[PDB]
Design a protein around this nucleic acid. Sequence first.
DNA 1: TCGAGTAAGCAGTCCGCG
DNA 2: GCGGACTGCTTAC
Length: 901
Amino acid sequence: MKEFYLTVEQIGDSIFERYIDSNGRERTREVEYKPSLFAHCPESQATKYFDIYGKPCTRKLFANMRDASQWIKRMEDIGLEALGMDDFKLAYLSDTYNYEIKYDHTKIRVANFDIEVTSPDGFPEPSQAKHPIDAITHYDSIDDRFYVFDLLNSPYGNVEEWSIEIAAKLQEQGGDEVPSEIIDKIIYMPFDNEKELLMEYLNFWQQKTPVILTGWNVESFAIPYVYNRIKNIFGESTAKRLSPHRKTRVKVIENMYGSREIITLFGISVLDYIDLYKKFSFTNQPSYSLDYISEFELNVGKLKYDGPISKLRESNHQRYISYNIIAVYRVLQIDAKRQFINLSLDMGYYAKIQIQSVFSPIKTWDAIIFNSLKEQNKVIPQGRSHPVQPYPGAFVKEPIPNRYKYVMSFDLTSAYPSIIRQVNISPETIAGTFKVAPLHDYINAVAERPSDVYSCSPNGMMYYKDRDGVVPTEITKVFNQRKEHKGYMLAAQRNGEIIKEALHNPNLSVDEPLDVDYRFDFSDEIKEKIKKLSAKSLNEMLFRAQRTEVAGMTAQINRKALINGLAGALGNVWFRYYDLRNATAITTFGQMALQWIERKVNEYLNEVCGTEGEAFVLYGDTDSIYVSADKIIDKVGESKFRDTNHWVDFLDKFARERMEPAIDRGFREMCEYMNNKQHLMFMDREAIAGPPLGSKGIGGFWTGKKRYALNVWDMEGTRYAEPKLKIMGLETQKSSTPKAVQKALKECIRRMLQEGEESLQEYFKEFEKEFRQLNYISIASVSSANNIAKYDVGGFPGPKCPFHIRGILTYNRAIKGNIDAPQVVEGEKVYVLPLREGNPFGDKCIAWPSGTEITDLIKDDVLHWMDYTVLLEKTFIKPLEGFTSAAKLDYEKKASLFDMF
DNA sequence: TCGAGTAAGCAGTCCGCG
DNA sequence: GCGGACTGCTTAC
Ligand SMILES: O=c1ccn([C@H]2C[C@H](O)[C@@H](COP(=O)(O)CP(=O)(O)OP(=O)(O)O)O2)c(=O)[nH]1
Ligand SMILES: [Mg+2]
Ligand SMILES: [Mg+2]
Ligand SMILES: [Mg+2]
Ligand SMILES: [Mg+2]
Ligand SMILES: [Mg+2]
């Protein structure tokens, strides 16, 4: 096989690299890498190296990496640009792996671990590590085994060995229900003291050194805990055995208000799964505890135990160890579904970076562009300092608040990367400027044509047309990867709907799910077999289709996030290619494009309908338009349609055959107007929305910008078995809204859009009557909690104290002097409840850590003093009032002259 | 919340508004 | 009571 790196580090004048060799074996080497950097030279000086602008450069070969760094400093002292890749390990990878890396994941050691630490005096601080580590479960991907290190003797209790037989048993048998598929994969090691446990763990770590290290909060908790505990017990040199090069650094992570410490293990790539999840999942969760996330992702029940975790080991060591094992497996189960590790490896190897650098689009793109330029013997510019400056972004159209019955939407494929490619926006393609007219003049095509030579953006910028910039070239490559994976995702989605249809009429038989590839549209043969399958088999197929869809989503959305990150990176001062001319060229062209196509679609629809000056486009945001199709529907008349699917087909056909050619003609004219390199403004039909045929549903509504709901029947080629609500921005979509309230508001919306006013009034009346029975957690608001100290004046709210911070302070007084009570963590999330006047807590609300039951110290007092009235008005009624007045509807029945009967 | 960007919505505090 | 100035939080894109 072709070789590939595992990890790379610079340590002084040496590169330390772990890698897989041509025979598929892991090796390590130390290389005295001689880096090169560059300086501009005279024209007369013969060279093959040129900066991105075509100015000649001489290569400076250094005796070592420290000489190279020192040279960069002196060039600053002199006042001269020092060109080239200043991160030497990135240049090393480029030289050493001068080809597209093809990696084999089966050779990469991926370690997933979790530790347990009993603590009677509060949260065990990883920087202190004053309490014994009493359990470690460490899954190794190469062995496919869970290694369990169990501490039997501790100052906090001596315990008996853990029993695998009881672990496997049902909870209804007094067992722990450790999943049977991992039982044979557990290698259990009890220890009589902590020192033996830790020395054996380090010997194990030496034999099976992680390349990729993950788990849940491993970077902020487990890794610093283990390191500092070992350091405390044995000293530094032993703790540094966690690094294969025996080098570690304490790293300070600084935020807006405060800072924390982590431990960098040189030669390991730590990818904390909580952080992978936050970056790649595109959710915002009320809580990030593993139980919460696991439940959300897998629909697995919460790990039940009695008492606090701090007394769990001594009261039920059996369950304690089982739950530590299950904790490790849950992260693996999430990964099987989300595939964020696979993603990270793909992106990391593509860019040629340390895999942990995937968290940084700036680092990722710097590497990609460096490698691309290096191939043409071009030399990257030095990074420079820039003051942060605000700059303009997208246009969002102000919608008229209303119900909207029939709606069709259109959206530009990868808007910003497409603009980059079309305009040829790049650091080295800047050709000059032209005199700018007001944006509205370009939108209405009355402004003077910017250029007859160069490709233009309405911000005043001009770009070369003879050759693609490096930014268009490289953004294109990742876009095509994105496009491929989106294809698989959509095919999996469409296949899902086929399965859902067949489920309505399943066969009464015993059989098996079909062996198929859900990334491709089902053949007719497959479709026929599907109609003859059982519910059991169909549901299993649905699950597999949906997993395939998720695999596709992960791959596509995060490649889109990567290319969109490059457009944003041009407006970040730390990016090597920061330039506000280029960032604003993108965003200003986007504004023009949207408003241009708005005018074109309006002009076209007025023409087909025979009207004049009427607004068909009701809304748009960044790169989308929402088109009212009432008039298109009315032109044939609702009476002509057999069923809902009939008018959906008609609208689908009208968009593809009439509107999209008009849209394409409109954008081609704009392309020529701007003299752009390549026409790439492609505005695919997204949604077809309206009420069920013959119903009293309203179809959709807007309340304002970025706030709307639609009853969708078809989403870019996916025809739904059951209509799907597309709700954007409304309270049903905010993590701050109580769970039960999200659900109730969504049903209210479903009824509005599908069934009409009376149905909505029926549901509201019922919800208002029963809601006080709802579980307190389901009706608690959620908020992030920053700057708790700032608003704390002697345990009481200071001036301008936010409502949720007020709640935390109320909580803090109520649990004061309890080092056992759960503490609210600065920067994390809390549940929030209003409290009735005259409550014993002495304030109008209380807050407690999100994802958890409130401590039994105060629970039933909270339940007794909950202000359901305020809770209802604030979270449910006020938002519902917003929805209904926008939609010109009433949630409560108005009195009629009929009432006199 | 270490980690590409801007636009913009709503909750809440403080305080004017004769 | 509402709304503007403001902070805080969250979402759409
Ligand atoms: O996090 C973001 C989201 C969007 N955009 C900018 C850049 C985006 O290009 C633009 C529009 O965003 P969408 O329409 O939502 C996604 P796109 O158009 O890229 O790709 P498809 O529509 O799925 O094909 O807004 C960003 O700069 N950052
Ligand atoms: Mg645990
Ligand atoms: Mg788009
Ligand atoms: Mg699309
Ligand atoms: Mg069937
Ligand atoms: Mg969009």
